[PDB]
Design a protein around this ligand. Structure first.
Ligand SMILES: CCCCCCCCCCCCCC(=O)CSCCNC(=O)CCNC(=O)[C@H](O)C(C)(C)COP(=O)(O)OP(=O)(O)OC[C@H]1O[C@@H](n2cnc3c(N)ncnc32)[C@H](O)[C@@H]1OP(=O)(O)O
Ligand SMILES: COc1cccc(COC(=O)c2sc3ccccc3c2OC2CCNCC2)c1
Ligand SMILES: [Cl-]
Ligand SMILES: [Mg+2]
Length: 384
């Protein structure tokens, strides 16, 4: 049963829609009727408006996530998004401070809950809808299974609806009512030895340590020799290349020139974008973001450095060549592992490029939207 989810404008567990259905569950909503009062929290807890632009507020959000955010099923790893990453993720064009919602415990003044949204135009099945992208829902490990999460969700929904937005996109590893797509992740080993010493990867009697190192070795030469860090001048070119590529997919964000500069211009230890320019034209792009995991209870290593495949477009190479280059660029930036979802064209290169299947999948969800579900090849958006 999904006692909370079932009260919400999302599909029931059995709902399945034709490709021709593509619409809200609840249309003709009115901003004027949205509740003005904040949702009621348990006694001794208060809403707090986080200023992601303030170093100190931002560090409180960081601590909460470092200690309490997503772990894998074996709880060896916990996501450790850096402060400077959270600042990029939360301050895209037209972002609203009042969509960055904390909850404090009054007696300690400590942040013990968070939820965020940013505004994004989302094209679902060729209809572009102004939506909210929701992320970084977190409750402190000590406060789990007390029905705080639905209060966080309902408060942000109300804050979102105040801006006349009635749809959202979000992703979770947990299964909820009901995904529009479901994409397994794959991982390409870069620093083999580390990955074995921490348990992520393993050896058979056939595959010895030296043999595993050799298996994953890469040639430090790019397939596209002029692939270079993106610069401000490249923004219009990236806009045209990415914008045109993304139109083939069933689900994707429609990016303005301003969002392209926000989402792609490199920031050390956050976002890496490389371009291939020919006649002042951007004809190829690789991008990936930095998402470390903290390694729980390993005597030797505290952090796994991990590049996450973001948006990759080639017109002068094979997609395999392009991704092979993405892997090398991540190795050049001291990543231990390169992670990708089986979205867009990704899956076609995983065998050849020596990716291993992960343990699970990332589900893609819409709020207050009814449509046909689809295979993840047709997914054209990567969240943070
Ligand atoms: C138009 C605007 C629309 C606005 C909003 C759109 C929707 C946005 C939705 C959010 C999108 C966020 C995307 C995102 O951030 C990326 S997915 C990452 C979520 N964060 C984590 O997993 C961190 C580790 N865990 C936690 O901090 C807690 O376990 C959380 C806070 C997850 C749940 O706290 P708790 O102490 O374990 O649980 P209770 O408080 O007792 O609450 C249980 C109720 O929460 C439902 N639940 C559990 N996990 C969920 C999840 N990941 N999405 C949605 N729902 C989730 C659950 O199914 C149940 O409902 P039910 O009884 O019906 O089954
Ligand atoms: C620490 O636990 C993990 C250990 C190993 C692997 C994972 C992976 O989980 C995910 O959801 C993934 S993979 C991937 C690969 C490329 C691009 C995105 C993602 C992704 O979603 C991201 C976007 C949604 N918000 C969290 C990360 C977890
Ligand atoms: Cl209610
Ligand atoms: Mg709770």
């Amino acid at each position: 049963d999904y006692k909370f989810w079932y009260t919400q404008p999302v599909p029931k567990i059995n709902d399945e829609f034709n490709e021709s259905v593509n619409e809200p569950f609840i249309s003709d909503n009115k901003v004027e009727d949205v509740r003005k009062d904040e949702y009621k929290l348990p006694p001794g807890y208060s809403w707090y408006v986080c200023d992601v632009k303030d170093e100190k507020d931002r560090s409180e959000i960081y601590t909460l996530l470092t200690d309490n955010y997503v772990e894998d099923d074996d709880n060896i790893f916990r996501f450790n998004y850096s402060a400077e990453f959270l600042l990029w993720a939360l301050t895209s064009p037209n972002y609203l401070k009042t969509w960055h919602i904390g909850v404090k415990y009054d007696a300690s003044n400590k942040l013990i809950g968070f939820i965020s949204a940013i505004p994004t135009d989302i094209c679902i099945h060729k209809r572009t809808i102004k939506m909210a992208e929701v992320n970084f829902l977190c409750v402190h490990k000590t406060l789990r299974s007390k029905r705080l999460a639905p209060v966080l969700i309902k408060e942000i929904t109300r804050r979102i609806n105040l801006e006349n937005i009635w749809q959202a996109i979000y992703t979770a590893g947990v299964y909820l009512p009901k995904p529009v797509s479901d994409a397994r992740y794959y991982h390409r080993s870069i620093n083999v030895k580390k990955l074995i010493e921490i348990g992520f990867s393993s050896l058979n009697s056939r595959l010895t340590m030296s043999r595993a190192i050799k298996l994953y070795r890469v040639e430090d030469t790019l397939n596209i020799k002029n692939m270079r860090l993106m610069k401000k001048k490249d923004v219009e070119g990236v806009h045209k290349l990415l914008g045109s590529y993304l139109e083939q997919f069933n689900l994707y964000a429609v990016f303005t020139k301003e969002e392209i500069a926000h989402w792609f211009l490199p920031i050390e230890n956050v976002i890496y974008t490389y371009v291939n320019e020919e006649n002042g034209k951007i004809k190829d792009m690789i991008s990936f973001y930095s998402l470390p995991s903290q390694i729980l209870g390993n005597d030797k290593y505290s952090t796994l450095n991990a590049a996450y495949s973001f948006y990759n477009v080639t017109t002068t190479a094979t997609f395999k060549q392009l991704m092979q280059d993405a892997i090398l660029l991540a190795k050049r930036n001291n990543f231990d592992v390169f992670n990708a979802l089986e979205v867009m064209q990704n899956k076609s290169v995983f065998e050849d490029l020596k990716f291993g299947e992960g343990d699970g999948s990332l589900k893609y969800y819409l709020y207050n939207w009814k449509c046909a579900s689809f295979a993840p090849a047709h997914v054209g958006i990567v969240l943070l």
